[PDB]
Swiss-Prot record, chain A:
Domain remarks: Contains two DNA recognition domains (TRD), each specifying recognition of one of the two defined components of the target sequence.
Reported function: The specificity (S) subunit of a type I restriction enzyme; this subunit dictates DNA sequence specificity. The presence or absence of a 4-residue repeat changes the sequence specificity; a third copy of TAEL inserted at position 179-180 changes the recognition site from 5'-GAAN(6)RTCG-3' (for EcoR124I) to 5'-GAAN(7)RTCG-3' (for EcoR124II).
Protein name: Type I restriction enzyme EcoR124I/EcoR124II specificity subunit
Gene Ontology biological-process entries: DNA restriction-modification system
Gene (name only): hsdS
Family: Belongs to the type-I restriction system S methylase family.
Subunit annotation: The type I restriction/modification system is composed of three polypeptides R, M and S; the restriction enzyme has stoichiometry R(2)M(2)S(1) while the methyltransferase is M(2)S(1). There is an equilibrium between R(2)M(2)S(1) and R(1)M(2)S(1); the latter is methylation and translocation proficient but restriction deficient.
UniProtKB/Swiss-Prot annotation, chain C:
Record's comment describing the protein's domains: The C-terminus is required for assembly of the restriction enzyme complex. The individual domains assume different positions in the enzyme, allowing the holoenzyme to regulate the methylase, endonuclease and translocation states.
The keyword DNA repair belongs to this UniProt entry's keyword annotation: no
NCBIfam families: hsdM
Keywords: DNA-binding, Methyltransferase, Plasmid, Restriction system, S-adenosyl-L-methionine, Transferase
Annotated protein name in UniProt: Type I restriction enzyme EcoR124I/EcoR124II methylase subunit
Organism per entry: Escherichia coli
Catalytic reaction(s) noted: a 2'-deoxyadenosine in DNA + S-adenosyl-L-methionine = an N(6)-methyl-2'-deoxyadenosine in DNA + S-adenosyl-L-homocysteine + H(+)
CDD domains assigned to the protein according to its UniProt record, in alphabetical order: AdoMet_MTases (cd02440)
Subunit: The type I restriction/modification system is composed of three polypeptides R, M and S; the restriction enzyme has stoichiometry R(2)M(2)S(1) while the methyltransferase is M(2)S(1). There is an equilibrium between R(2)M(2)S(1) and R(1)M(2)S(1); the latter is methylation and translocation proficient but restriction deficient.
Length: 384, 163, 472, 42
C-alpha cells in the first residue's frame, strides 16, 4: 500500500459510444435472448442477437447510465446489447484494470461522480481525472492485493443480491402461505359480514388555516402518505390536542387499525397499519375498532389477508381518485372464528411477517445496515 | 455533384471563358490542359460551383480537394445536411472535431418525437404508471431540451449537437 | 383577504371568454377609471361622477400635456353606458381621435389601440358597453397594483416572460448596491416591465430621474407594458418605451452610455448573422472577435450590455444556464469577458423559482468596478423555491445575498471568490465551485455491527421457529 | 359496471420449489455471513 499514485480516468480506459444500434423494435418477449438493457435497472427482456451488431463480447465491460444522471452503474456481465443510452466503458490496458475494480472505483466517490441533477453531459468529468490507483505496483501485485479485497467486496455485493433474492422468495412464499393456510377454516366458522365486529369509523377533516389547531399539541395526524407502513403508533404530523374542537375526528384507543379508501387502491392491495396511540385522521381514509368478538390483530390481518379480494369487494365506486366505498366494504362474509381460535394462527401470522417486514427486526433493515457497512468499508479500504 | 467552373483570371472579365465542370479530384495540369494557359499563370477563377457548402472566390485547388476529402470522409447523411450542420459550426475540421458528437434521428421527426423517445424508450424516469401514462408533457419537455440542447431540424431527421 | 376578494373577481370576470378581447375592456375601462379618479379629481375643485362639458380644454390642455390626453368630455364611462336601443353602433376601434392622436404634445403614438369607435351592432354592441362597463364601473377598492386582475389577465396563461415578482424583487434589491446616481434608469429588452415598476415605484421618493427605454418585439405586448406602469401613476408624459428589435435598432445609440441597467433576456432572441450587415464590423462584435451564431445569440446581449455601461454603475442580467463557456465558439467571448473584469460577479439560483422552467438561471452582474479577483459568489438554495406565501418580505436571504454581494463574504456550503488567473487556469468554471458537502454520513463499526448481529440472532431463531410453524 | 369485471391476472405457485430455494439461499447466506465475519478484520 506504498506505491500509490493518482491516475487519470481515461488513461487506461477505452471509453466509447454505442455504435449503430437498431434496437427500435416493438416486442421483447422472453423467447428472444439478449437483454435490451436500458437505464434504471439493467434488464428489459430478450431480443434477437442475430444480425443487429450487439457487442456482447468481453464478459466484463461496464457502462454509464445516464446521460444527465451519470450514476447508474452496471457490470456488463454476460452477453449484452447496446440499447440506446449505453455509453460503453472498458479499458485499453487490460493488464492492470480488472474493471470491477474500477466499477467499484466509480462509487468510491459518489460525492462528485454519482450525483445526477440537471441536463448536462459530463464527458470531461468521468474522462479526465483522477483516481487513486496502486500504480506503480502496476500491473502485477497491484491486481494481486486488490484481488483480495475485490473478492471480499464481490462477496459483499453478492450478499446484497442474495439477501434481496431471499427477501423476495420469503415474501412470495409467505404471501402464498397466508392464504393457502388460514383460509377455508372449519368448522363451522361464522361468515361474519364486514364491519359488524365493531363500530368502525370514518374520520374527520380539520381546517388547516386554524394555526392553533395545526401546529401545537401532540395528537399524531395520520395521512395516506404516512400510511403504507405497518404498526404506525404515531405519525409524522403532530396536530393539536385541542384541534378536536374544529377537526370532527374520531378519538381512538391503543388498539385501533387503519384503512385507506383513496389514491392507491382500485389498482393494488390496500395499506394498513396498527395505530396504537390516541390519534386522529381525515375523510381521506378510515379507521376500524373491533368489539369483543375478535382479535384486533386478527381483524388487521383479516383485512390484509383478504386484501386481494376486499379490493374487489367494493371495487370501483368511481374511477376517480375517489375509490372503494363503505358499502361493500361493509358487505362481505368473511370467516371470523371464536375468541379461542384467533390468537394462535394470527400469532404465527404476526410472527412471520414481523420476521420479514418493516422495520426493526426486519430483513430490509438488515440489508440497509449491510449496505451501510459495505459503503463504509469501501471508504475504509481505499483509504490505503 | 460537387463540380466547379474555374477559369480564368487571364482576361479577367471572364474573357477566355473555358473549362466547364471539374469533379473531384482536380489537378493543376488536368485543368491546365483543359484551358491552355493565359500566357502566364493566373487561373482557377472561381465563379460557379455545385457544392453542398460555401466556397470562396480564390480558394486553391489543393484546398478544394482537401474540402472534398473531408466531405468524402463524412457519412452521406451528413453530406446531405452539411448545409444545415455548418450553420452551427464555421469550418469542416471544426466539424471533424465533434463528428462523433452528433445524435441522428431518422426515428424522431419533430421535437415531440424527441421528447417521447428520450422519455419512453430511453427510460429516463423508469415508471410509467397507467395513471401517469398520458401525463408526461412532451411539449414542455421539448421546449426545455430546446433551451438546453443544440438541435437542428433537417429533412432526414433531427440532429442533436450534444457536446 | 381583500386580495382574496379581488382575486375572486379576477376569477369570475374571466367568464366567459379569455383576456384577448377583455384586454380592451379592462385597459380602456381602467384607463378612464383612472382618468375619472385623477383627471376628474383635478376638476372636482364635489360635482360629478357623471362628468360633463366642464373640462375647458383650452385650460385642460395641461393634462393633455401631462396625462397626455383630454380623453372624453362627452364620452365618459357614465356618458356612454346607460341603455338599450340607441344610435349608434361604433365605439371601440377608430374615432376617439382627440385622445388617440393628441399631437400637442409628447404624443407617444399607438397610445390608444384598444377602443375608440367601431363597432359591430346597434346596442347589442353599445348595450354591451352599457352593461359590462357598468358592471366594471362599480368594481370598487373593496391601489398600488389595483390591476392585480390585470396582473392576472396578463398571467391568464401564466396562472414566456411574464415577470415573476419574487425574481423581480430579487433583481431590484440586487440592483443594489452603489445606487443613488444618474441616470435612473435604463432597460434594454424589457417586455412586461413591471419589474421596472417594483424597481422604481418602490424607489419613487428614493430617486426618480429618467425614462425606461425598453424594447420588445410584440406590439400588443409593447403597448400593454407601456400603459401597465401608467395604470398606477408611473408617468408617461416623457418617460417612455421604444419599439423594435434591440440589435437592428439599439436606439438610443447616442443617449447615452448608460450607467445602471437591468434586463431579463428571454428566449426567442436568436438571429442570423454572422454578420451579413456591417454589424460584422460594429462597435460590439468586432471586440467579440467571433460573432453571435444563429441560435445562441443570447451572448450578444451581454455584448450589448457592455456597450451601454460605465464603471461605477452596475448591471444585472440573467441567462438560462447554457453558458459554461460554450466551447471555442464562445470561449474567446468568455475570454473577452475575462480579458478584464468586464463581468464582475455571477450568482446562481434554484430550479424552479419561475413559471415552469424548471431550470435555474445565471445572474451576471457587470461593472468595471474591479478589485481584481474572480467572483463565484453564488448560492443555489435556499432561496426557498416553493412559492410566494412563505418568507414573503425577505426570503431570509436577500439581506444575506445582499451581504455576499456587498463584500466578499466567503461562507462554506456556498461558493467564494477565486483567483482571476484560476478561471484561465481552469477551463472557465461556470459554475462548479463550490458545491460543498451534502449527505456524507459516517457511523460506528461496533454500533452498526452489533445491532446487525443482534437483529440477525433474532432472525435466526425466527427462521427456525418459522420452519417449525411451516409444518402443517 | 361492477358486475361483472371478472378477475384478471391471478397466479399462485407450489411450496417445495420456494422452500428449497429458501433453505439453499439461507445456507449460502450463512456461509457468506461467517465469511464476512472472517472479513471483519480490524
Amino acid at each position: 500500500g506504498v506505491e500509490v499514485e493518482w491516475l487519470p480516468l481515461g488513461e487506461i480506459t477505452k471509453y466509447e459510444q454505442p455504435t449503430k444500434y437498431l434496437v427500435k423494435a416493438k416486442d421483447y418477449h422472453d423467447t428472444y435472448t439478449i437483454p435490451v438493457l436500458t437505464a434504471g435497472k439493467t434488464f428489459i427482456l430478450g431480443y434477437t442477437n442475430e444480425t443487429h451488431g450487439i457487442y456482447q463480447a468481453s464478459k466484463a465491460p461496464v457502462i454509464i447510465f445516464d446521460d444527465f444522471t451519470t450514476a447508474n452503474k452496471w457490470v456488463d456481465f454476460d452477453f449484452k446489447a447496446k440499447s440506446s443510452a449505453m455509453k460503453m466503458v472498458t479499458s485499453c490496458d487490460d493488464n492492470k484494470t480488472l474493471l470491477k475494480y474500477v466499477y467499484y472505483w466509480l462509487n468510491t466517490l459518489p460525492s462528485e461522480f454519482a450525483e445526477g441533477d440537471h441536463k448536462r453531459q459530463w464527458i470531461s468529468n468521468y474522462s479526465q481525472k483522477k483516481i487513486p490507483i496502486p500504480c506503480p505496483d502496476n500491473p502485477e501485485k497491484s491486481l494481486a492485493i486488490q484481488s483480495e479485497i475485490v473478492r471480499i467486496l464481490d462477496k459483499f455485493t453478492a450478499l446484497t443480491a442474495e439477501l434481496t433474492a431471499e427477501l423476495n422468495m420469503r415474501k412470495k412464499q409467505y404471501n402464498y402461505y397466508r392464504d393457502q393456510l388460514l383460509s377455508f377454516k372449519e368448522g363451522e366458522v361464522e361468515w361474519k359480514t364486514l364491519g359488524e365486529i365493531g363500530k368502525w369509523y370514518g374520520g374527520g377533516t380539520p381546517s388547516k388555516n386554524k394555526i392553533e389547531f395545526w401546529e401545537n399539541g401532540s395528537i399524531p395526524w395520520i395521512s395516506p402518505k404516512d400510511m403504507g407502513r405497518t404498526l404506525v403508533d404515531s405519525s409524522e404530523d403532530y396536530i393539536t390536542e385541542e384541534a378536536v374542537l374544529h377537526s370532527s375526528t374520531k378519538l381512538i384507543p391503543a388498539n385501533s387499525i387503519a384503512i385507506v379508501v383513496r389514491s392507491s387502491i382500485l389498482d393494488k392491495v390496500l395499506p394498513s397499519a396498527l395505530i396504537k396511540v390516541p390519534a386522529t385522521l381525515n375523510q381521506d381514509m378510515k379507521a376500524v375498532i373491533p368489539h369483543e368478538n375478535i382479535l384486533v390483530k386478527y381483524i388487521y390481518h383479516m383485512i390484509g389477508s383478504r386484501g386481494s379480494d376486499i379490493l374487489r369487494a367494493a371495487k370501483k365506486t368511481g374511477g376517480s381518485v375517489a375509490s372503494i366505498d363503505s358499502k361493500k366494504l361493509f358487505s362481505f362474509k368473511i370467516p371470523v372464528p371464536n375468541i379461542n381460535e384467533q390468537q394462535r394462527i394470527v400469532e404465527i401470522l404476526d410472527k412471520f411477517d414481523t420476521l420479514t417486514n418493516s422495520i426493526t427486526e426486519g430483513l430490509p433493515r438488515e440489508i440497509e445496515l449491510r449496505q451501510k457497512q459495505y459503503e463504509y468499508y469501501r471508504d475504509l479500504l481505499f483509504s490505503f | 455533384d460537387m463540380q466547379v467552373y474555374i477559369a480564368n483570371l487571364g482576361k479577367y472579365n471572364e474573357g477566355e471563358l473555358v473549362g466547364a465542370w471539374f469533379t473531384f479530384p482536380i489537378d493543376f495540369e488536368e485543368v491546365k490542359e483543359k484551358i491552355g494557359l493565359n500566357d502566364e499563370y493566373e487561373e482557377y477563377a472561381i465563379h460557379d460551383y455545385e457544392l453542398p457548402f460555401t466556397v470562396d472566390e480564390y480558394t486553391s485547388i489543393g484546398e478544394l480537394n482537401r474540402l472534398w476529402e473531408m466531405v468524402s470522409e463524412l457519412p452521406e447523411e451528413l453530406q446531405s445536411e452539411l448545409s444545415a450542420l455548418l450553420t452551427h459550426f464555421s469550418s469542416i475540421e471544426e466539424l471533424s472535431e465533434h463528428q462523433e458528437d452528433i445524435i441522428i434521428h431518422s426515428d424522431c421527426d419533430d421535437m415531440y418525437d424527441v421528447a417521447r423517445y428520450y422519455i419512453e424508450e430511453t427510460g429516463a424516469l423508469g415508471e410509467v404508471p397507467a395513471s401517469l401514462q398520458n401525463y408526461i408533457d412532451y411539449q414542455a419537455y421539448g421546449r426545455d431540451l430546446d433551451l438546453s440542447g443544440t438541435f437542428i431540424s433537417t429533412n432526414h431527421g433531427i440532429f442533436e449537437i450534444v457536446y | 383577504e381583500l386580495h382574496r376578494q379581488i382575486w375572486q373577481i379576477a376569477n369570475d370576470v374571466r367568464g366567459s371568454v379569455d383576456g384577448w378581447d377583455f384586454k380592451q375592456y379592462v385597459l380602456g375601462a381602467l384607463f378612464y377609471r383612472f382618468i375619472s379618479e385623477n383627471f376628474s379629481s383635478y376638476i372636482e375643485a364635489t360635482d360629478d361622477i357623471k362628468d360633463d362639458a366642464i373640462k375647458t380644454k383650452g385650460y385642460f390642455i395641461y393634462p393633455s400635456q401631462l396625462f397626455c390626453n383630454v380623453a372624453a368630455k362627452a364620452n365618459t364611462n357614465d356618458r356612454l353606458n346607460a341603455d338599450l336601443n340607441s344610435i349608434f353602433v361604433a365605439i371601440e376601434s377608430s374615432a376617439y381621435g382627440y385622445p388617440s392622436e393628441a399631437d400637442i404634445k409628447g404624443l407617444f403614438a399607438d397610445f390608444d389601440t384598444t377602443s375608440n369607435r367601431l363597432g359591430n351592432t346597434v346596442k347589442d354592441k353599445n348595450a354591451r358597453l352599457a352593461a359590462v362597463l357598468k358592471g366594471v364601473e362599480g368594481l370598487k377598492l373593496g391601489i398600488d397594483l389595483f390591476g392585480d386582475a390585470y396582473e392576472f389577465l396578463i398571467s391568464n396563461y401564466a396562472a414566456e416572460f411574464f415577470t415573476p415578482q419574487h425574481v423581480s424583487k430579487l433583481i431590484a434589491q440586487l440592483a443594489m448596491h452603489g445606487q443613488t446616481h444618474v441616470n435612473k434608469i435604463y432597460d434594454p429588452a424589457a417586455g412586461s416591465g413591471s419589474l421596472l415598476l417594483q424597481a422604481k415605484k418602490q424607489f419613487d421618493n428614493h430617486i426618480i430621474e429618467e425614462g425606461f427605454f425598453g424594447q420588445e418585439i410584440n406590439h400588443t405586448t409593447y403597448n400593454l407594458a407601456r400603459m401597465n406602469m401608467f395604470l398606477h401613476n408611473i408617468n408617461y408624459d416623457k418617460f417612455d418605451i421604444k419599439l423594435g428589435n434591440t440589435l437592428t435598432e439599439p436606439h438610443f445609440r447616442d443617449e447615452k452610455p448608460f450607467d445602471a441597467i437591468v434586463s431579463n433576456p428571454p428566449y426567442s432572441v436568436k438571429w442570423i448573422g454572422s454578420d451579413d450587415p456591417t454589424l460584422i464590423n460594429d462597435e460590439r462584435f468586432a471586440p467579440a472577435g467571433v460573432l453571435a451564431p444563429k441560435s445562441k445569440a443570447d451572448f450578444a446581449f451581454v455584448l450589448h450590455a457592455l456597450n451601454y455601461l460605465s464603471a461605477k454603475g452596475r448591471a444585472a442580467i440573467v441567462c438560462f444556464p447554457g453558458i459554461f463557456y460554450r466551447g471555442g465558439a464562445e470561449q474567446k467571448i468568455r475570454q473577452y469577458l475575462v480579458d478584464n473584469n468586464y463581468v464582475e460577479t455571477v450568482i446562481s439560483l434554484a430550479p424552479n423559482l419561475f413559471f415552469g422552467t424548471t431550470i435555474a438561471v445565471n445572474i451576471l452582474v457587470l461593472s468595471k468596478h474591479k478589485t481584481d479577483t474572480n467572483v463565484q459568489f453564488i448560492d443555489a438554495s435556499e432561496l426557498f423555491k416553493k412559492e410566494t406565501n412563505n418568507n414573503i418580505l425577505t426570503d431570509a436571504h436577500i439581506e444575506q445575498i445582499m451581504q455576499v454581494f456587498a463584500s466578499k463574504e466567503d461562507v462554506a456550503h456556498l461558493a467564494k471568490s477565486v483567483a482571476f488567473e484560476t478561471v484561465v487556469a481552469n477551463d472557465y468554471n461556470l459554475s462548479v465551485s463550490s458545491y460543498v458537502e451534502a449527505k456524507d454520513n459516517r457511523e460506528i463499526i461496533d454500533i452498526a455491527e452489533l445491532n446487525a448481529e443482534l437483529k440477525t440472532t433474532v432472525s435466526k431463531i425466527d427462521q427456525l421457529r418459522k420452519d417449525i410453524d411451516a409444518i402443517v
